[PDB]
C-alpha cells in the first residue's frame, strides 16, 4: 500500500535556546506561517542582559582604581551664588592624596555632590566617600564613551530567528504574519528606568503589554506610537582638573564652577505629554473598566535609583523627579520642568560589590531624547505609578517581536514508492 519515505531538508522547526552572536558597525516572508510568540519567556532577553553587563565590566578593567581616595575628607559649604534648590547639594572637600611617589602627599580640594559623600560620627566637617565601607570605586576611563551603540543579534547555523510583523501584536499568542530573518535589527542598549528612551515606536496605536494584566505584581510596558521629546540640561559651567595619584594614574574632578549654581532639570512639552496620557488611558480602559477612573501617581518609595528617572545625559548620570508627569486623574507653549540630581558614584546594575566613579565633564551639558514608552505598575479607581528598576524590561521592549527556533530538517511521510 504505502511505504515510509525519508526526506531531508524539510522546512520544520522547534522552539529552542542557543547562544546568539554579535554583529555591529536577509528577510523571508513565510507566506502561510502562523507562529506562537511569548515575550517574557524569550531567552534572547536573558542573553542580552548578561552580554551588556559583561561588556560593561570589561571596559573598566584597564581604568584607574580609586583606592588612594578612601581618606577622610574635610567638607565645607561652597562659596558661590547657590540658589535655593541647590542649597546643600555641593560640598567643597579637602583631602591629602597620594602622588606618583610613595613618600609624597598633595593637598587637593574638589567639589562633590552631597549624594556621593557621607558624614562620619555625625561630624559636619569630616566626610568619607559613599562606597569606602562596601567597595573599591573604579574610575571610568575618560576616553571611553557611554553611548548606546546598536547591537544586532545573529543566529548560528542550524537555527533561525523568526520575527512577528503584526502591528497590533501585544507580545503573546499567535502571530499571523511571520518572517524569517538572519539577524535582528540594531538594538540600542539604552539604560534608563521609568521612561524608555530612544526605542522603537508602535506603528499604529499605543500598545500595553503585561505578562498578566490583572496581576498587580507585574509591570506594564507601554509602547507609544508617537515620541515625546524631552530636553535635559545641567546648566553649570564645570572646570575640570586632574591630579596624579599614582604611576601614570590620573584622577579627574570638578575644581570649580564658573558663575551661579543652578539645578539640573528636564523639560517635557505640557501639551504633548497630556495627549500621550490620554492615549494611554484609552488603551488601559480596554483591560480595566470603561466607566472607570484612571489615576496617575508618583513612585511610592525606595531609593533614588528607583523613585526617579535615571539616565545618562552626555556622560553624566541624572536622577529626575517625574511627579510632574504622573500627577492627574482621568474620570470617564508650556512645558513641565522636572528637577534632577546628579551623582558621580553609581552602581549601574542592581549589584552590591561594584561601584564606578564617573569623572566630570568639562563645560555645560545638554541632551535631547525621545520618550518611546513607559514602565508602569498598578496598585473603583485604578492607580498607576512609574516602575522600571529592572533593566531586563528595557530589553523586552525591543526583543518582544523575535523568537529563536531550531531547524529540524529530517522527517518521514508515507508514499507509494518502495525500495
Amino acid at each position: 500500500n504505502l511505504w515510509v519515505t525519508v526526506y531531508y531538508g524539510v522546512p520544520v522547526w522547534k522552539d529552542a535556546e542557543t547562544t546568539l552572536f554579535c554583529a555591529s558597525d536577509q528577510e523571508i516572508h513565510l507566506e502561510n506561517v502562523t507562529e506562537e510568540f511569548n515575550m517574557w519567556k524569550n531567552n534572547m532577553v536573558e542573553q542580552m542582559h548578561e552580554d551588556i553587563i559583561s561588556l560593561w565590566d570589561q571596559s573598566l578593567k584597564p581604568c584607574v582604581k580609586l583606592t588612594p581616595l578612601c581618606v577622610t575628607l574635610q567638607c565645607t559649604n561652597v562659596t558661590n551664588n547657590i540658589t535655593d534648590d541647590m542649597r546643600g547639594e555641593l560640598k567643597n572637600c579637602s583631602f591629602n592624596a597620594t602622588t606618583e611617589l610613595r613618600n609624597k602627599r598633595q593637598k587637593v580640594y574638589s567639589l562633590f555632590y552631597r549624594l556621593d559623600i557621607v558624614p562620619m560620627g555625625e561630624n559636619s566637617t569630616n566626610y568619607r566617600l559613599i562606597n569606602c565601607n562596601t567597595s573599591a570605586i573604579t574610575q571610568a576611563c575618560p576616553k571611553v564613551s557611554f553611548e548606546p551603540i546598536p547591537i544586532h543579534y545573529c543566529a548560528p547555523a542550524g537555527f533561525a530567528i523568526l520575527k512577528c510583523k503584526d502591528k497590533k501584536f501585544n507580545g503573546t499568542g499567535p502571530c499571523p504574519s511571520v518572517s524569517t530573518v538572519q539577524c535582528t535589527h540594531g538594538i540600542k542598549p539604552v539604560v534608563s528606568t521609568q521612561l524608555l528612551l530612544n526605542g522603537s515606536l508602535a506603528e499604529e496605536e499605543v500598545i500595553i503589554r503585561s505578562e498578566n494584566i490583572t496581576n498587580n505584581a507585574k509591570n506594564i510596558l507601554v509602547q507609544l506610537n508617537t515620541p515625546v521629546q524631552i530636553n535635559c540640561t545641567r546648566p553649570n559651567n564645570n572646570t575640570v582638573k586632574s591630579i596624579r595619584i599614582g604611576p601614570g594614574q590620573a584622577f579627574y574632578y570638578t575644581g570649580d564652577i564658573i558663575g551661579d549654581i543652578r539645578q539640573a532639570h528636564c523639560n517635557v512639552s505640557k501639551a504633548t505629554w497630556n495627549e500621550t496620557l490620554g492615549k494611554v488611558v484609552k488603551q488601559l480602559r480596554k483591560h480595566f473598566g470603561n466607566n472607570t477612573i484612571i489615576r496617575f501617581a508618583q513612585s511610592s518609595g525606595g531609593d533614588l535609583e528607583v523613585t526617579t528617572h535615571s539616565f545618562n545625559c552626555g556622560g553624566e548620570f541624572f536622577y529626575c523627579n517625574t511627579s510632574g508627569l504622573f500627577n492627574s486623574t482621568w474620570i470617564s507653549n508650556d512645558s513641565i520642568t522636572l528637577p534632577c540630581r546628579i551623582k558621580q558614584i553609581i552602581n549601574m546594575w542592581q549589584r552590591i560589590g561594584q561601584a564606578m566613579y564617573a569623572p566630570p565633564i568639562q563645560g555645560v551639558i545638554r541632551c535631547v531624547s525621545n520618550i518611546t514608552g513607559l514602565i508602569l505598575t498598578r496598585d473603583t479607581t485604578e492607580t498607576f505609578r512609574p516602575g522600571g528598576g529592572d533593566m531586563r524590561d528595557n530589553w523586552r521592549s525591543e526583543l518582544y517581536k523575535y523568537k529563536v527556533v531550531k531547524i529540524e530538517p529530517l522527517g518521514v511521510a508515507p508514499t507509494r514508492c518502495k525500495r
Binding site: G9, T19, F21, N32, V33, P156, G158, I407
Partner: protein, 120 residues
C-alpha cells in the same frame, strides 16, 4: 524561494525545496561562540549518521522497505501531500518517530546481510 519560504506551503510543494534548507545547516568571550559552532557540527553529523544507518546516505529523498502502519496515521495521500504542511505533519506523528526510526534501522541491517551473501 529562500530559506523556510515553503514552510507554509503543502508537503508536496515544500518537498521541492529540500536543497534550500540543507544548505543552511552549515555556516572567556568567544568561547560560547565556539561551543555553538562545535555543537552545530555535532548535530549535523548525527543526522547524517542516521541517514547512513538507514541506507539513505547521499540523498535528500530516500525510499525504504518499511511499510506504513495506519496506527501512525490513517490519512490518505491527498490529505497528506495536498494539505497538512510539514509543520502540521510533524506534530501529528511526533509520538511515532522513534518506532519508525527503529524499524528503518532494522530493515537496513537485514538488507546489508542479504546482499553480502548474494555477492558470495
Amino acid at each position: 524561494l529562500g530559506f523556510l519560504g515553503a514552510a507554509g506551503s503543502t508537503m508536496g510543494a515544500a518537498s521541492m525545496t529540500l536543497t534550500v534548507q540543507a544548505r543552511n545547516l552549515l555556516s572567556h568571550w568567544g568561547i560560547k561562540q565556539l561551543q555553538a559552532r562545535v555543537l552545530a557540527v555535532e548535530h549535523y553529523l548525527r543526522d547524517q549518521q542516521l541517514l547512513g544507518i538507514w541506507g539513505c546516505s547521499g540523498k535528500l529523498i530516500c525510499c525504504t522497505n518499511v511499510p506504513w502502519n495506519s496506527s501512525w496515521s490513517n490519512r490518505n495521500l491527498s490529505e497528506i501531500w495536498d494539505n497538512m504542511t510539514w509543520l502540521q505533519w510533524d506534530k501529528e506523528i511526533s509520538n511515532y518517530t522513534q518506532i519508525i526510526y527503529g524499524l528503518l534501522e532494522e530493515s537496513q541491517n537485514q538488507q546489508e546481510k542479504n546482499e553480502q551473501d548474494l555477492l558470495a
